[PDB]
From a paper:
The acyl-ACP synthetase (termed AasS) of the zoonotic pathogen Vibrio harveyi recycles exogenous fatty acid (eFA), bypassing the requirement of type II fatty acid synthesis (FAS II), a druggable pathway. Very recently, the AasS (533 aa) of V. harveyi was found to feature a large domain at N-terminus (termed AasS_N) that is connected with a compact C-terminal domain by a flexible linker. As expected, a hexamer ring-like overall structure was invariantly formed in all the three types of AasS particles, regardless of a cofactor/inhibitor. Obviously, the pattern of AasS oligomerization is recognized as a trimer of dimers, which mainly relies on two interfaces constituted by the AasS_N domain.
In addition to the two controls we introduced, (i) AasS alone and (ii) its complex with C10-AMP adenylate, we focused on the complex of AasS liganded with C10-AMS inhibitor. Unlike the two controls that are characterized with a dimension of ‘140x150x80 Å’, the inhibitor-bound AasS architecture is relatively compact, because that its dimension is only confined to ‘130x140x65 Å’. Except for a sulfamoyl moiety that replaces a phosphate group, the C10-AMS inhibitor resembles the C10-AMP intermediate. Structural alignment of C10-AMP adenylate-bound conformation with its C10-AMS inhibitor-liganded form, elucidated that conformational transition is due to the 140° rotation of the compact AasS_C domain. As predicted, C10-AMS inhibitor was also found to bind an array of almost-identical active sites in the AasS_N part. However, AasS_C domain adopts a closed conformation rather than an open state to benefit its C10-AMS recognition. In place of K522 exploited in C10-AMP binding, the AasS_C K432 residue produces several interactions with surrounding oxygen atoms. Additionally, The W437 residue here forms a hydrogen bond with the bridging oxygen atom. Unexpectedly, this inhibitor was found to trap AasS enzyme in a ‘closed’ conformation, which likely represents the enzyme at the very beginning of the second step reaction where the adenylate serves as a substrate, before the binding of the ACP thiol substrate. The resultant blockade prevents other substrates from binding/entering AasS enzyme.
Residue numbers in the entry:
A (entry chain B), B (entry chain A), C (entry chain D): 6 to 532
Write the structure that this text describes.
């Protein structure tokens, strides 16, 4: 450790922030409420407790928790002692969750009591975990008891900024969940990079030191988009809602005067459709919408409620944020219909992001508002590869750029607009489902000859899976029978819960290509 | 060059900014005006011209220029081809300037025609420079002609982010000017670090994308505090005033609607005292004051003009910015007298800066509002050492922290307040003078027995040098004779021009210590 | 490549064998029959075909095939060009097979047509495979057509002997299948090491140059125990039976005059129980029994048929062979009952194997015939770790020895006798099932409170799983309902086919320990 050789460490985000008010509050719904000074104490207590549990630098601590203060402490204390924080996506099927736990080789799992039923399905096949800390919202929490037995004093190590700080698994690709990891330097740069982008907005879409922060993106989803790191960096009041309940979320916005939040379009649809939201005041509330395309109708409805609603774009692989919608003063003077179109765009690339539209030959395409191609990016917060993966990692970084798998056109003013997907994947309410995997399960039916699963757009869910099934030579099976057939795979924890919204459309034939492959591009036009 | 191994390069500040409007203007006073798209073209043309002149990676290009568009292009094009940009402090004496040119081994000097008289004094003793490009504000500029002969196309190299990008020399220490250098990574982090700090301010002291930028800090002074990099990153309109004339500066603020600027307290004193400023409107003008302590009276006078005036602190060695004044909403509601006290503080440390108060034994002192000690800092943009210097570099980084040489107390809320200096140096209107060097010159007088030079505070200049001279056994020399004696050293280019404000006070004795050393701490109390 | 620096390469097993008769035959059941000279030609043709398909050194070629001549060519040609041969255990569930294909990142899969139904279950989730070569026992084989288009000339590379030659996955541990790998040097040493052991036997249990070899161990099971490499090294006639049919196997033994074979005890039980075997002559037939404990009754029945039947011991992790039964001339003169006891022992350690009995503290135990402990081994053909695995690899090599997970006592004469298992795993007919995984599936039943699965010994299957289920507070579910419940998991390809032999025994309570854990050691005594 050379003192002049500064390392970009997550501990510098905490102890060298943009602003620190020791009396500013971290609020956990209606369960807990303490100050930033207490939060710094609990990070050091957690670091002491982790050291006592034998967590060393390079160890993996897994977290299965809701959006809480404990998760925020996990964001700092675990990477800050040099350990790897593994955010377990609790919305995956138990079999997928078991894979990521064994693949990541977690030493300790901090699991909420409500996720214990998931554990009992896969506990026997977990071999790396030596300790389970059960998390509770009451005084009987094992995490809270571990912290109480520790001092609020800890000297956090200096290590290389390229130490891996966080890992998590995305199901956005084919096959098994892929592990993406991020270093301390990448997370620090992502915090400063996006703060420099959305902090410096003139009027609209600002994250500033006077904001009150409440995530409605799960903290296992690409670091809650990285906003808890930015919210801590700004020293703002942070409200953690726990398990997402629309009435609980709406009460927290009014009671804690939340001004900045973020979520997938499904959450905003649920928040705006709730009967209690009708009498609510949203004048000071800003929400950035990511994970899925923001519908113009949903953006318009939020605008009528005086919500500063704008869109953002990112990936698990890309330290999430790649582009955010920024409106010029001229664009802010437009009518609600014209404003809703700009606010629902994919967005302009954020600072230090090189986003290009290319074709299959990696040739860069002109940035007119019509020519479409895959988005390839270079940024200081991209995963260099998938964890313990070679061939898929090479495809991710083919041609020297990270491939997003998203087809988009970029206009003259830099506004990206995603048109469709390269990958044969469907995102439902923020969770991934693989069409090929869904086809395989539905093909296991005895009276099924061919299955083609496509993503049908949905106003509430974003996309829903549509299975176009060709019957056998003399087979007659109703559509709802296949839905019940696939439900049994969900009940066993093999298929994702989001396939419960699958629609089966029996068709006489499935359109193909001259080579014999299924033509899904032409298939979506017909249905 | 590994594509996934992102390098923090100054070319990423330009081509991956927070915002880019190709039709946004770069304005050079009343001489030139072009768009950001032209500015990017002229950077590539300059890169082509530098390549033709044989500038390679690792070469030093020196610039002797006013605050212009050419200097802004020098900020990018020279580091972006991997060359070292040397900002020559044209306010130093010609002998000091000659030292820094030979010490830095400049290959090419871009010198304005008005600085040619400085060159003719030291041209014979310059051995490393092979080409002089003369800069002119008219069409006869050699820099403009070099650019016209080049294409607007250039592929900027990828190199290590630890490549040195900028060098310049500070006279704030004893002895010869010391060379501080900064890498691409340090400059990029300084841009994002301070943008995350002042961009995210809620209301007061904001640098945002809607601002109009005009520096009144010279661009050879620690990168104009780094603001031109931040202004380019935000893609804002930039107004470069050229040579500082109070009427010209005031006209540019009104005509170009400047909203963000920065300067030393002397400049603000001159701007506010100008008769034309009385009828001017300063409602939208924000200026951050650094380099010297901001007097409460000057801050109050600016506040009566509705100027968002706040203070900042930094050094040549520290990538300048270490702390900036940020006001909470409660502090913004105070009266003008109470507000002027907070706005004139040294400030709260910026993001990623670890500022401590220590004693001579490097023991960290409590942060009460009374206990004073030297500020020692750790930050991602500090010079690791002085150029081609070992012993002074070790003292700069003694105890693992960079020593500022400034004595301060930090209060409970984190507000730093500088009390006095460790180093025996005096800063006059933003330029350094060494008391020991001034004593040596005045000691060369035949009728001088002892000389002690101390810095007397000044309302306009900040500090002025005061020489307390003890006469010889039977000598009688008037005070004004010594002032003329020292003026001859200035006319020869050996002593700094700022010593013209020296005051000689003949005293019967000079207070000393038990060890025999001069007691300057007790000496300032008496006079 | 230093010519004097000899590398132990699999190509030296082929082109520098103990004996080479160019007119000696490789027989594939009743489908194909060619000479050793043709076999060497087809290895070079396969090497040419693999080079044309773009297989480079370090690539993985996966094989899903029966015991054939093609598999024998795969044993040589794939490692001999420096590629990794992945032997896919086709008896695993499709989900397990999919895991090993994705974990190993196979580039090309050589799959028999009869295993294509397994592929269609998991084809959509396979991402690394670019080519499937379908294998057929007729002239329409894609492998045969690929070979016909190539020359019989190939210069095989010299590389480091530590190049990994073979990979395969064992399910003998908890969690996911673990990848064990072996280098060229390890495989060469395993061939010479065991040839020096069983070749030098005086009379009984000899593998010599006059033998006729027929494997009845699948070639995906630890290299068919390594015998095809040894059989090729000796240049003996090799008979490959394809898919195991008891009448087909018995016909090949009589028709091809097979003298040396090997199998699990279940196969020998099936061969001896077949009605056609009654009239067969087994005077010259030797078979070594591994994978499971050889019952004394089965050994005695084989001895009455004049079969030279002896036992051997090994693992997937241990290059299989660790110990083989060798009988002294005095032991060969004993009666059939006393001989059957010695022939059914675990065996004496083979050359270059250091086998020790230790306790949980890695303390070596005395080699009396009663004291039992875990077998830990050091040998020149052990896997150094599991593929892409750290924590499980450390447990495998805890204390500097490879842990077998087998409890045994070693007598004074060196005869090992395995008593029970450390790992909570059950082996059924040569395939592994995890008790904890079986408990988890049976625990998913709504009317199940506690499940404890233990391995009950079986005369035919070796071990069968026994589930002792404690009913809920007021639940009444029949035992056969749970068997049908678990069968559905098998039909979906999640649970192993070998769980079809599970027995459910409803019990009022499950014996536990003072710590609360299930006491399976005491549980097996009760049931
Ligand atoms: C200031 C925050 C602003 C940033 C928010 C977005 C971050 C979301 C992090 C996140 O979806 N990871 S993922 O691996 O679960 O999904 C990644 C995929 O989702 C899609 N997609 C994400 N955003 C989208 C958007 N605005 N419009 C349309 N499509 C969007 C897209 O196909 C991505 O490739
Ligand atoms: C957003 C910009 C806000 C940052 C402006 C300050 C940067 C000035 C960069 C710069 O003075 N370098 S130097 O080497 O020529 O001088 C360095 C010395 O000057 C003194 N000193 C600088 N600031 C001061 C301040 N606010 N109050 C009091 N004393 C101040 C101090 O003794 C430093 O050690
Ligand atoms: C000349 C050949 C002579 C060598 C034949 C044995 C090689 C078998 C290669 C093979 O079982 N791998 S495994 O990973 O599928 O199983 C490994 C486990 O099986 C058990 N076990 C293997 N043999 C056994 C035996 N003779 N008596 C009793 N128990 C035996 C034992 O618990 C092992 O740990
Ligand atoms: Mg993703
Ligand atoms: Mg300085
Ligand atoms: Mg094994």
């Amino acid at each position: 450790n050379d003192p002049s050789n500064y390392q970009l460490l997550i501990k510098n985000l905490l102890f060298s922030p943009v602003a620190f008010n020791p009396e500013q509050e971290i609020v956990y719904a209606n369960h807990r409420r303490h100050s930033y000074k207490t939060f710094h104490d609990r990070v050091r207590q957690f670091a002491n407790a982790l050291t006592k549990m034998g967590v060393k630098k390079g160890d993996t601590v897994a977290v299965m928790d809701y959006d809480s203060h404990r998760y925020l402490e996990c964001y700092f204390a675990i990477p800050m002692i040099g350990a790897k924080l593994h955010m377990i996506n609790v919305r995956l099927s138990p079999e997928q969750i078991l894979y990521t736990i064994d693949h990541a080789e977690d030493d300790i799992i901090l699991i909420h009591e409500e996720f214990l039923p998931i554990l009992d399905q896969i506990k026997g096949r977990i071999d790396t975990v030596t300790r389970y800390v059960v998390l509770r919202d009451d005084e009987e929490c094992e995490y809270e008891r571990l912290l109480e037995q520790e001092s609020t004093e800890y000297n956090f190590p200096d290590f290389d900024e390229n130490t891996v700080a966080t890992t998590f698994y995305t199901t956005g690709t084919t096959g098994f969940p892929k592990g993406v990891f991020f270093t301390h330097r990448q997370l620090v740069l992502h915090t400063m990079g996006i703060l420099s982008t959305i902090g410096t907005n003139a009027s609209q879409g600002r994250l500033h030191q006077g904001d009150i922060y409440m995530p409605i993106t799960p903290m296992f989803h690409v670091h809650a988009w990285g906003l808890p790191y930015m919210a801590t960096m700004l020293g703002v009041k942070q409200v953690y809602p726990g398990k997402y309940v629309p009435d609980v979320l709406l009460n927290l916005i009014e009671q804690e005067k939340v001004t900045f939040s973020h979520c997938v379009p499904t959450i905003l649809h649920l928040l705006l459709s709730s009967p209690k939201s009708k009498a609510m005041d949203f004048s000071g509330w800003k929400v950035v919408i990511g994970g899925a395309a923001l519908p113009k109708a949903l953006c318009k409805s939020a605008l009528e409620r005086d919500i500063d609603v704008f869109a953002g774009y990112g990936m698990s692989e890309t330290g999430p944020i790649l582009s955010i919608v920024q409106l010029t003063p001229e664009q802010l003077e437009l009518d609600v219909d014209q404003q809703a179109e700009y606010r629902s765009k994919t967005g302009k690339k954020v600072a230090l992001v090189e986003a290009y539209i290319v074709d299959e030959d990696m040739n860069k395409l002109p940035h007119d508002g019509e020519t479409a191609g895959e988005i390839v990016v270079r940024a200081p917060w991209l995963t260099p590869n998938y964890y313990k993966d070679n061939k898929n990692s090479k495809a991710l970084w083919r041609g020297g750029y990270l491939h997003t798998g998203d087809v988009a056109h970029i206009d003259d003013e830099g506004f990206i607009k995603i048109t469709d997907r390269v990958k044969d994947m469907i995102k439902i309410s923020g969770e991934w489902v693989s069409s090929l995997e869904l086809e395989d399960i539905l093909h296991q039916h005895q009276s099924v000859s061919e299955v083609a699963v496509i993503g049908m757009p949905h106003n509430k869910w974003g996309e829903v899976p549509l299975a176009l099934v060709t019957l056998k030579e003399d087979a007659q099976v109703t559509e709802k029978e296949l839905l019940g057939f696939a439900k049994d795979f969900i009940n066993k924890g093999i298929l994702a819960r989001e396939a419960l919204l699958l629609k089966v459309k029996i068709v006489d034939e499935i359109a193909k290509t001259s080579v014999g492959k299924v033509d899904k591009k032409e298939l979506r036009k017909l249905h």
